[PDB]
Amino acid sequence: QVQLQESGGGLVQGSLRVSCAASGRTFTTYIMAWFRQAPGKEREFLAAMDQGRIQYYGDSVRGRFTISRDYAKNSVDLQLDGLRPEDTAVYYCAAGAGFWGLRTASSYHYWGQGTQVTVSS
Amino acid sequence: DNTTVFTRILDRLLDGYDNRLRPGLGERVTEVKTDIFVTSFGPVSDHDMEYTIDVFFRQSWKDERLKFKGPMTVLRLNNLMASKIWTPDTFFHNGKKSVAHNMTMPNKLLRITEDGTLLYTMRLTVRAECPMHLEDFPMDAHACPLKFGSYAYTRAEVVYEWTREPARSVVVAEDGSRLNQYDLLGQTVDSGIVQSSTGEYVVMTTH
Amino acid sequence: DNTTVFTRILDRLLDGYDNRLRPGLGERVTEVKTDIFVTSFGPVSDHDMEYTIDVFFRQSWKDERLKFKGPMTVLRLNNLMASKIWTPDTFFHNGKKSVAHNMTMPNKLLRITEDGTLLYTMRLTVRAECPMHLEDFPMDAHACPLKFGSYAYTR
Amino acid sequence: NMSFVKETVDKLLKGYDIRLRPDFGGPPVCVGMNIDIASIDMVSEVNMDYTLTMYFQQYWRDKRLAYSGIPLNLTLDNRVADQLWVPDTYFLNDKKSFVHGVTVKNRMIRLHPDGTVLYGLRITTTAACMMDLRRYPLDEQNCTLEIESYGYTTDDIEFYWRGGDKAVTGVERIELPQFSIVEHRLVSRNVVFATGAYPRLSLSFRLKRNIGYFILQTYM
Amino acid sequence: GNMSFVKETVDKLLKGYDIRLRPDFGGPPVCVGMNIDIASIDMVSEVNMDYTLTMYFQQYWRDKRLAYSGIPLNLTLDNRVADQLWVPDTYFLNDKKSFVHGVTVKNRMIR
Amino acid sequence: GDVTVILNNLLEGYDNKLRPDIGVKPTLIHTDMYVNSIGPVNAINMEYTIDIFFAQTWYDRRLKFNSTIKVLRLNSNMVGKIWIPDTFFRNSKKADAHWITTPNRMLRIWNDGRVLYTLRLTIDAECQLQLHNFPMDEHSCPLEFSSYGYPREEIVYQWKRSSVEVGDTRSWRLYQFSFVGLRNTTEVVKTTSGDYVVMSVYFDLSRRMGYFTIQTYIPCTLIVVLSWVSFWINKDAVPARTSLGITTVLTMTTLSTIARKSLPKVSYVT
Ligand SMILES: *[C@@H]1O[C@H](CO)[C@@H](O[C@@H]2O[C@H](CO)[C@@H](O[C@@H]3O[C@H](CO[C@H]4O[C@H](CO[C@H]5O[C@H](CO)[C@@H](O)[C@H](O)[C@@H]5O[C@H]5O[C@H](CO)[C@@H](O)[C@H](O)[C@@H]5O)[C@@H](O)[C@H](O[C@H]5O[C@H](CO)[C@@H](O)[C@H](O)[C@@H]5O)[C@@H]4O)[C@@H](O)[C@H](O[C@H]4O[C@H](CO)[C@@H](O)[C@H](O)[C@@H]4O[C@H]4O[C@H](CO)[C@@H](O)[C@H](O)[C@@H]4O[C@H]4O[C@H](CO)[C@@H](O)[C@H](O)[C@@H]4O)[C@@H]3O)[C@H](O)[C@H]2NC(C)=O)[C@H](O)[C@H]1NC(C)=O
Ligand SMILES: *[C@@H]1O[C@H](CO)[C@@H](O[C@@H]2O[C@H](CO)[C@@H](O[C@@H]3O[C@H](CO[C@H]4O[C@H](CO[C@H]5O[C@H](CO)[C@@H](O)[C@H](O)[C@@H]5O)[C@@H](O)[C@H](O)[C@@H]4O)[C@@H](O)[C@H](O[C@H]4O[C@H](CO)[C@@H](O)[C@H](O)[C@@H]4O[C@H]4O[C@H](CO)[C@@H](O)[C@H](O)[C@@H]4O)[C@@H]3O)[C@H](O)[C@H]2NC(C)=O)[C@H](O)[C@H]1NC(C)=O
Ligand SMILES: *[C@@H]1O[C@H](CO)[C@@H](O[C@@H]2O[C@H](CO)[C@@H](O[C@@H]3O[C@H](CO[C@H]4O[C@H](CO)[C@@H](O)[C@H](O)[C@@H]4O)[C@@H](O)[C@H](O[C@H]4O[C@H](CO)[C@@H](O)[C@H](O)[C@@H]4O)[C@@H]3O)[C@H](O)[C@H]2NC(C)=O)[C@H](O)[C@H]1NC(C)=O
Ligand SMILES: *[C@@H]1O[C@H](CO)[C@@H](O[C@@H]2O[C@H](CO)[C@@H](O[C@@H]3O[C@H](CO)[C@@H](O)[C@H](O)[C@@H]3O)[C@H](O)[C@H]2NC(C)=O)[C@H](O)[C@H]1NC(C)=O
Ligand SMILES: *[C@@H]1O[C@H](CO)[C@@H](O[C@@H]2O[C@H](CO)[C@@H](O[C@@H]3O[C@H](CO)[C@@H](O)[C@H](O)[C@@H]3O)[C@H](O)[C@H]2NC(C)=O)[C@H](O)[C@H]1NC(C)=O
Ligand SMILES: *[C@@H]1O[C@H](CO)[C@@H](O[C@@H]2O[C@H](CO)[C@@H](O)[C@H](O)[C@H]2NC(C)=O)[C@H](O)[C@H]1NC(C)=O
Ligand SMILES: CC(=O)[C@H]1CC[C@H]2[C@@H]3CC=C4C[C@@H](OS(=O)(=O)O)CC[C@]4(C)[C@H]3CC[C@]12C
Ligand SMILES: [Cl-]
């Protein structure tokens, strides 16, 4: 089975780092991305990274979040800075070649269990 | 001669023009508005994990040094004048071995407008890598990228933009489709960043 | 400054250096001393009777016109200035699409000695013809030749 | 006299801006064309293209090059083509093309007394020709070469076939191992691109595939 | 700051620059740091017994002649300037066929 | 020394754009060949790769110099400075000169003004093979050349006493074919630009059956003999005779497929 385990904090007042490790398949040639789900059932794209180290971002978080990949360890990391109270959401880690996508959840065939992150002022 | 004045204008354009420096070195960021007209999507060689595409890759940027005044509002110059002045060093990140067609001469043109805006159209045949996951072969589907950007200039020096909106900037000719066993469903246009050893660069991509 | 002296020496070397004419024209015969250092004997193509050979083809010859006096015994000219100095016109009598490496810089070297002796080192890959007699195949033996000499200049 | 020809040519090339077309402000330049199809080397269906060797020749008028007192057509050495303006023609359906270059670059420059320039090139081009093999080997394919001006719009240049229907010659002498030319057609029109309206010429052959090979190898 | 000052700075740097002479031909050896970045390996063929490699080959070296002050930012000059400056005679001993990618311009960087 | 000033005097006032005798008479060119090796005859593409040392000779009145130096030998440096004929091969699909260790070009100038130019070439020339009698066929493959721009009124090529020459033919790469003999011809060809003196060298080649006699003729005959073996088998052995018949028929079909693998897709019976 192909598993996308996730890690990272859930409570912050701030800076954070959310990691995602893949097991059961080498995602060297796949595109690894992060998605956000605020309460309201509206999945939002956050960031994605290719085999060519090329980073794509959503307009809401351009320059606030930084995506990175570690190909030797087969993982994708997201460094979050400037967290605002509206950023409270469940962050999911996804992988898969971008067919008709690269900004749409329909193109990703693998998903993480998701991690809740909350911001309290 | 009636047209000799135009030559004088050209002789006044390059007077003191240092081509080695970009339009805005140390003062601004040289915005480049680029777009592609895919004249023919070449055959996809699944053996080499490679595909081919023939494009009228055309770019534009503002260079205030070349501002002028004259009879015509636009000067359509030969390919030599393009080599005579600065131009972007755009390349294709996933490209393998392309050729700029020069039959009968270099398929290039330059249009200098009175305000200093340029327009440097080309005619390229790029054969680029298309990584594939053949788990569902022969019933699979792929997204072949075409990623291009500057080679020398980082984000702070040169930034690329799409001329029209991203969806409508890349246009594919209807009659031009050389694919034999494949079917081109469409394209998705996007932009992003690559952080290399030298620095940070803007990469404009079309899947 | 240590730079300007050698800059002016190099600039003064070719004052009238007629590269169109061989050294010692009209009073002697140019004795080109040559040798080969084969890096790797390439594969033999049976279908074409062609074989590749990568070489470090070295030539040398005396040239009185290029004599000089300076702090250094040997001057290492750059690749491009060798165009302005006469060099032998060696060709391989049995060659087919032989190539000279131009990465990252032309694989050429020109060295000039104070006595005027020039050394000209060149890196090549030669695709030469090896006319075979495949009558004892696959138990045959061949003597593949490699022949070279001047093109324009005679004995 | 060689001296008079030399000084006349020196006067012609002096004070000549290559960057400007023959009338940078004025009517378009009527650039006629004609072709001599030397051969069609390899009509490949695996790659959907065909190789074509040709003697692509262009004719036009240039008042700057006109000369008087020498009633002879000056056939100049090919290198002078670098020093003169020529049209920016290109083959739109091209994949890989080149100018044959032995012993020298196969190129022709002939100046006429009235400033009428002939510019000849011996070109080899692998032109794309997509094929519909639903009737293979009984198919009948349509392969075309599309000549077009690159930068000059229809207001600056105009293309026409110099001869009407005899501009392309040598088609009947072409022989192919597989196909057999049944018809060739010349068309002139104007196309519209994202950056204006350009002229266009089209040379289209119809190739009928022979059946004897497939009778020998497959049907029998 | 202004374009003109940088223009005159570049012209001053390239004035009197002898491309033949290495940065310290009379002096210690010049140190060249190489920072290859492998982009792809395409065809590891046993028939030809060779492999293809696409990479970004970079070379760092300290040329004291090309030294400037008053402009506190690295100058990314046009690629053609590489023909007017000294560069190492680097080459790959075990090569068979290689080329520099030439679209749109020659993919070459001088900084 | 003296040669330097002689060449400097020659070059000054020399316009390489104009041929010698621009408005006096046509320029006579004496041509000759020395065939190094006729390469493999690619029958599928219907061509052959010849290698030659093409040498031309002409008279340029502007290059007359009177001095003790009877003749000036040179290298490729002076090729571009003076006018050169634009000779090209009409039936060449692919041609190229040799460019190591220096451009393989020779230029010699006599006091009277005679210029001798010479260069090595590797010419892929198309040869329209008629394979009706394959493998027992013969061919007359041509190699044609002429001036490109200059019509007959300006340049007139011509052969020499012994123009085409061939060395030891045993070193050539003619595998199936055997060189019979060569001959030369001259004609005037009328193209849209005018008239041109087109000169041809025909090489006569004859294929050798040997390989094919080992490849297709013997195997086929055996399968026919093999088929004949069926008659001696008893007529009661139905499966044996049937198996023998079908095996021979399929083997004949396979050999037929192998037979036409070395030719172009000609639509007639060989
Ligand atoms: C479409 O785009 C195409 C791609 O850009 C384009 O193709 C190119 O076209 C140009 C223009 O026609 C070609 O340029 C010419 O090439 C001639 C040689 O061609 C052969 O060699 C090149 C490789 O060239 C290098 O190597 C050869 C030897 O191998 C050298 O002779 C070259 O100078 C050059 O040398 C350097 O590089 C070497 C390593 O590569 C180093 O070892 C060396 O030290 C040098 O640094 C091949 O590419 C050619 O083949 C390919 O291209 C052809 C194109 O038709 C294809 O058909 C073929 O299939 C291949 O793909 C080929 O093998 C040069 O001779 C020529 O330069 C001479 O002529 C020009 C004329 O303008 C002069 O300006 C120039 O100075 C040269 O003349 C001097 O030198 C000669 C020789 O001695 C003298 O005879 C002459 O009198 C003159 O003398 C003066 O200079 C001497 C010193 O040089 C001095 O000693 C004398 O005293 C005197 O002062 C020119 O460069 C180019 O090769 C094509 N290909 C490529 C890849 O660039 C195509 O045309 C475009 N099409 C159109 C229609 O636009
Ligand atoms: C193997 O690898 C090597 C190394 O990479 C390759 O080497 C390169 O090869 C190039 C091609 O030969 C060569 O470039 C030419 O150099 C000539 C040298 O002549 C003088 O050059 C300058 C003159 O200064 C003025 O001109 C330059 C531009 O040329 C400007 O930058 C200056 O500001 C001045 O205005 C001085 O160094 C000396 O005076 C030299 O004597 C150049 O003449 C030649 O110029 C032509 O091409 C230019 C590029 O297109 C063009 O801008 C210029 O206008 C010239 O144009 C020619 O063609 C037009 C056609 O219409 C014609 O009108 C012109 O009159 C002219 O004939 C080139 O710049 C590189 O220097 C060289 N690099 C080296 C050696 O390190 C080698 O090619 C490669 N071999 C292969 C791949 O086969
Ligand atoms: C291989 O396949 C190609 C593609 O199918 C064929 O190409 C077509 O061939 C036909 C042959 O008749 C061409 O037809 C002609 O097109 C001209 C277009 O010019 C302009 O005409 C009007 C007015 O401007 C507009 O439609 C538009 O602006 C065009 O640009 C017409 O003008 C021609 O008609 C006129 O002239 C003819 C005589 O030449 C008269 O008889 C008519 O009455 C009329 O006055 C004509 O229709 C067609 O354009 C080609 N299409 C192309 C090139 O894309 C090849 O023929 C085919 N080869 C074969 C079969 O061997
Ligand atoms: C240099 O070449 C030109 C071009 O060939 C010579 O010009 C004469 O050009 C005309 C075309 O404009 C040729 O046409 C013929 O056309 C007329 C109609 O114009 C027709 O009635 C004739 O039956 C013939 O088909 C003409 O033949 C041509 N003349 C010659 C003698 O070739 C020009 O004369 C040449 N310069 C010289 C010979 O000094
Ligand atoms: C011009 O180029 C130089 C060299 O690339 C730039 O300087 C270098 O910039 C990097 C950051 O981009 C510095 O990296 C950091 O260094 C500290 C201290 O070692 C380290 O703790 C960090 O982890 C990081 O590696 C680097 O030190 C710095 N060094 C030098 C030699 O300057 C410079 O900023 C560029 N200038 C411009 C205007 O682009
Ligand atoms: C090329 O053709 C010429 C002309 O036919 C040949 O030379 C002639 O040969 C005949 C027969 O020996 C002589 O009568 C003529 O006098 C020769 N003419 C000249 C000008 O010499 C020449 O031998 C042929 N070259 C070959 C066959 O390689
Ligand atoms: C041309 C070919 O491709 C050959 C290669 C091997 C051959 C087969 C080997 C064995 C037998 C068994 C025999 O059964 S019997 O009891 O009737 O003998 C019938 C004939 C049959 C099927 C042969 C037919 C021809 C072949 C398929
Ligand atoms: Cl396919």
XYZ file of C-alpha atoms in Angstrom, chain C:
155
model
C 53.788 45.591 -14.452
C 54.459 41.945 -15.291
C 51.441 41.844 -17.645
C 52.254 44.640 -20.097
C 55.712 43.264 -20.948
C 54.311 39.955 -22.186
C 51.341 41.692 -23.805
C 53.734 43.778 -25.895
C 55.925 40.736 -26.599
C 52.942 38.826 -27.990
C 51.794 41.881 -29.945
C 55.297 42.338 -31.402
C 55.731 38.658 -32.330
C 53.420 38.819 -35.391
C 54.681 42.107 -36.951
C 54.640 41.000 -40.622
C 54.128 37.304 -39.748
C 53.039 36.115 -43.190
C 51.078 32.997 -42.237
C 50.440 32.348 -45.947
C 54.031 31.081 -46.412
C 55.741 28.109 -44.811
C 58.740 28.735 -42.527
C 62.119 28.700 -44.218
C 60.612 29.269 -47.664
C 63.333 29.270 -50.318
C 66.345 28.294 -48.172
C 65.362 25.024 -46.444
C 62.701 22.322 -46.100
C 60.392 22.375 -43.088
C 60.989 19.235 -40.997
C 57.744 18.599 -39.122
C 58.304 16.111 -36.289
C 55.024 14.396 -35.405
C 53.736 11.718 -33.056
C 50.429 10.268 -31.875
C 49.159 9.336 -28.407
C 46.090 7.114 -28.778
C 43.790 7.626 -25.799
C 41.404 4.819 -26.758
C 41.128 2.584 -29.813
C 37.493 2.958 -30.798
C 35.161 0.179 -31.898
C 35.700 -1.379 -35.310
C 32.592 -1.113 -37.494
C 32.546 -4.268 -39.605
C 29.671 -3.021 -41.767
C 31.584 0.042 -42.986
C 35.093 -1.358 -42.456
C 35.564 1.838 -40.457
C 37.253 2.201 -37.076
C 37.343 5.121 -34.660
C 40.497 6.226 -32.868
C 40.839 9.071 -30.354
C 44.250 10.731 -30.591
C 46.305 13.561 -29.105
C 48.002 14.276 -32.443
C 51.184 16.233 -31.711
C 53.282 18.130 -34.251
C 56.338 20.320 -33.878
C 58.616 22.334 -36.126
C 61.278 25.030 -36.128
C 60.306 28.592 -37.042
C 62.908 31.359 -37.013
C 60.352 34.113 -37.658
C 58.801 33.561 -34.201
C 62.015 33.802 -32.163
C 61.727 35.991 -29.080
C 63.511 36.938 -25.860
C 61.705 37.275 -22.549
C 61.545 36.120 -18.925
C 59.751 32.857 -19.785
C 61.213 30.050 -21.872
C 57.841 28.869 -23.246
C 54.907 31.011 -24.402
C 51.499 29.296 -24.457
C 49.461 31.039 -27.135
C 45.686 30.825 -27.010
C 43.728 28.744 -29.504
C 42.553 31.567 -31.759
C 45.910 33.271 -32.351
C 47.188 30.031 -33.893
C 45.109 31.067 -36.917
C 47.613 33.903 -37.467
C 50.640 31.536 -37.439
C 51.501 29.003 -40.128
C 50.791 25.391 -39.197
C 51.086 22.151 -41.178
C 48.096 21.077 -43.268
C 48.111 17.405 -42.248
C 45.149 15.348 -43.446
C 44.416 11.668 -42.909
C 44.549 9.907 -46.277
C 41.879 7.438 -45.085
C 39.410 9.513 -43.092
C 35.632 9.762 -42.955
C 33.908 12.499 -40.928
C 36.809 12.778 -38.460
C 36.007 15.391 -35.730
C 38.013 17.886 -33.585
C 36.550 18.549 -30.092
C 35.303 22.165 -29.571
C 34.126 21.725 -25.935
C 34.339 23.651 -23.698
C 37.139 25.317 -25.728
C 38.907 24.243 -28.972
C 41.121 21.286 -27.902
C 44.254 22.949 -29.379
C 47.526 24.093 -27.859
C 50.376 26.134 -29.342
C 53.656 26.525 -27.444
C 56.567 28.676 -28.646
C 60.138 28.310 -27.369
C 62.747 31.072 -27.232
C 64.796 29.256 -29.883
C 61.719 29.348 -32.156
C 60.611 25.720 -31.864
C 56.821 25.380 -32.006
C 54.798 22.552 -30.477
C 51.233 22.170 -31.776
C 49.081 19.695 -29.846
C 45.659 18.706 -31.162
C 42.958 16.348 -29.898
C 40.991 14.442 -32.533
C 38.672 11.516 -33.116
C 39.540 9.955 -36.481
C 37.125 7.630 -38.294
C 39.530 5.799 -40.595
C 39.031 3.141 -43.260
C 40.283 -0.407 -42.629
C 39.820 -2.367 -45.886
C 39.149 -5.910 -44.701
C 39.364 -9.338 -46.340
C 36.588 -11.262 -44.573
C 37.558 -14.627 -46.061
C 38.491 -16.309 -42.748
C 35.572 -14.845 -40.799
C 35.098 -15.147 -37.762
C 38.731 -16.281 -37.446
C 40.472 -13.475 -39.341
C 43.159 -10.907 -38.583
C 43.485 -7.374 -39.949
C 46.101 -4.629 -40.190
C 44.037 -1.449 -40.163
C 46.126 1.455 -41.554
C 46.229 5.086 -40.503
C 48.083 7.312 -42.977
C 48.649 11.061 -42.871
C 50.716 13.721 -44.584
C 50.702 17.197 -46.050
C 47.973 18.169 -48.514
C 49.365 21.163 -50.420
C 53.097 21.022 -49.708
C 55.146 18.429 -51.581
C 58.239 16.442 -50.604
